[PDB]
Symmetry: D3
Subunit: 152 residues, 6 copies
């Protein structure tokens, strides 16, 4: 496949998503890094987003609840290059009816090569990374070349 | 769960999606129903959309290729009430890498209660149906009440 | 692959299936179009089928419960050309233990090209189509040619 | 879940299923045990069944090909108590488009408590078991009591 | 794929795994066949293993709970040729969060060609088989040749 | 779910895994960061591990190939606290026969809270983070308390 590059802005567009049993963990993590997170643009699925802003007073762009289409909205944003970082604390110990949406979101985040964290340890490692506040170049698939081949 | 209603406009916003082995099937279907489809608003995933407009000259709002996020873009539109009909000829005899996206899209179309066709027979029944050109009231989940309960 | 045709009879063999949280939805729908549905042949999975006939008095050929094999029984009938329409209101907001059976059934209905409705909106559009009570030709895979190639 | 019993006849109704890459293995196994298999009733999916009878001359009740609905036909027979043994050599090293059918068939064989072999070693152990040729009593779910509870 | 052979010892290394709703089923099965199981080496996932030894007094090498990694530990042992028989009573009527682990374990047991039972009927047939207490060869993939080809 | 802590050593035990189509990407990544990686303990699935050591001369503890049980071996090591970092470049654009193993491994890495990278962008962020070269305490589920509750 053909690759090209895209630049993640210094001010990142961060998506925050958490399954019910992981919400408390994300809440703590957010409050813990609030000073830093306040410098970036926050997005989240319906319930997560509302709980975060209601507790931290931070401004969060909340989409629909995950089961109602929120995960796909986030996924769409990622593919459109509008989300630079994805913090998705999905529940590995409970079955979710919208599991396909969950897997699809993680698959897209992988395809588009953006930093992704699915647990607190990875989230801390990412946010503490030196370049998390700088503009950073990532290799992404060259869609134009890709689509051109499908139509040749 | 509480329900409410939404009105599908007379002029429908139709999403056209087809997996590679089903593209010819959808092409023919579109061509044979062109006179009727020309009166509605067409959307489609990357490859499908381009092949349709290139062959029929019809105007199609093409999103990204399915594997690159197109299916989630369509799903997001559905959950936002911007797509009224989904024609998704997915391939039942081949494994697709983005199967989760596929299943997630069909799951959302089910949740939001919009007419969905996954084969030619169902597509024909829907397009030939009386209210396909009339405004129709469909029952959809009441998101406001739903979110309110989660945030209680 | 090789395709051929089959004719859906004017009188259709309809399969009615609904997951627990969608049963009320299907019941209402059925009652709504009872006069029309009585003109066709009804089949259903165990619980769904029994609740329908017990409430409407309609004659329903009830198979086993979905989790106990009912979905595969319906799927088998579809592949054998004995089911012409599938009304399957599956639950998109709850995880079902027999999910593979659910996906398998929907996969077969897609392969054999029969009208399928997974929500009320699609069900209404289908039943209101002019040719619902007419015979209609559908393209189905040519199994004979298919198997011949495999051997 | 109340349980009841069912008796597997001395002459068993055996289903033989194999994915393409495992067909040679099943063939060999069938040929090596032909003398014994000949005193039971054989059923199989389309391709497998035809290959077996064309090679061994044995009489096999062949259903549809697995991908065309053959697995669900076998599954239905199992739930109806018409299949006593399932020898299903599915391919663990290749993705199959009809994976849900495959998983659904194995799920049913588990629910109805019939002997199932998914590899040669298990097949050999089962066929060599003393009670393979006698009437065996197995515990199966009591459907009547089960359905009655659902309609309470 | 070129195969090779491996010999299952007379004293089998048996893995016992059961989902919560099937635990009673496995317990009874184990108690009924205790005299025979006593002759082999028993392994199990966390909860299953502890319930068995606590009820039968038998010695069970218990690994982690299935959801916490126990299924993959068993799977790793199988692939390493350290498990000869797998008795896995998984629940076909309930969705399990660690379903991928369950499917991955069953997939590996299939690849490495070891006797596997997912219900009581199959378990009984296997344990009652003559070579269950005998050393016996099984055909297994020839990994060395396989890896050599990948490189 | 009672939580406890575990310390990730300064010298990390890193698992390197890549699907065939992503192998060149991981190779490049490993080569450009070789000086740093040479300081930690490397583990990998069969093919990946062998390709890495054959190309970099680095010492890699290679397990079985992924499809043959390699992923479960890595998963088992993670649950036993023997792996501290997982770099798993799985293919989001191809269906893998051993998908359940892939999902199971990722599910375990999430449960045990260890840093996980599934694309180059995340891998770079993690390796450039301060605590990659230092010892650091992370929270993990308290298994003792967990098991104790299951047997009560």
């Amino acid at each position: 496949m053909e690759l090209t590059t895209r630049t993640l802005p210094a001010r990142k567009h961060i998506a925050l998503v958490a399954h019910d049993h992981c919400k408390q963990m994300l809440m703590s993590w957010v409050e813990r890094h609030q000073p830093l997170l306040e410098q970036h643009v926050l997005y989240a699925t319906g319930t997560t987003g509302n709980l975060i802003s209601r507790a931290t007073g931070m401004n969060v762009n909340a989409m629909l609840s995950g089961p109602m289409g929120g995960d796909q909205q986030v996924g769409a944003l990622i593919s459109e290059g509008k989300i630079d970082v994805l913090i998705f604390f999905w529940d590995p110990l409970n079955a979710v009816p919208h599991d396909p949406d969950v897997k699809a979101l993680l698959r897209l985040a992988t395809v588009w090569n953006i930093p992704v964290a699915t647990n607190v340890a990875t989230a801390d490692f990412i946010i503490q990374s030196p370049h998390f506040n700088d503009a950073v170049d990532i290799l992404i698939p060259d869609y134009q070349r890709y689509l051109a081949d499908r139509l040749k």
